[PDB]
Amino acid sequence: GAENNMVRLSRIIIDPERLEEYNAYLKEEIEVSMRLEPGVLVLYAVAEKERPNHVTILEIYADEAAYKSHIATPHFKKYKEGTLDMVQMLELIDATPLIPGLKMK
């Protein structure tokens, strides 16, 4: 439920020359995850308008089991392997939501 969801921010810097390829892989992998995995509650990615190769993803998983299952999926594998040479920085920020379970209108 809301009280044990794993919430994380991923902050990524992508090689500017590979940004189109990266976005193609990322968008597909998010779409498949949202479609197929009940434990993936959101993968909400945004690109900074001033620096479009700086992407932040708000990640909410039902629990750590859901997260571990997610990173074993073929769709996550395709993304992780496909983009390995495109990522310049990856920051993984575990976080606590101020209002657990707050949803978008």
Annotated binding site: 4-5, 15, 17, 62
Q: How far apart are CA 35 and CA 73, in angstroms?
A: 13
In the complex, the residues that contact Ca ion under the rule CB under 5 A are 1, 4-5, 15, 17, 62-63
Which residue matches tokens 């993803």?
Answer: 57
Decide if residue 90 touches a second copy (CB under 8 A).
no
Give residues with Cβ within 8 angstroms of 28, minimum separation 6: 75, 78, 79
What does the binding site for a second copy look like in residue numbers (CB under 8 A)? 7, 9, 23, 26-27, 30-31, 34, 38, 40-42, 44-50, 52, 55-56, 58, 60, 93-99, 102-105
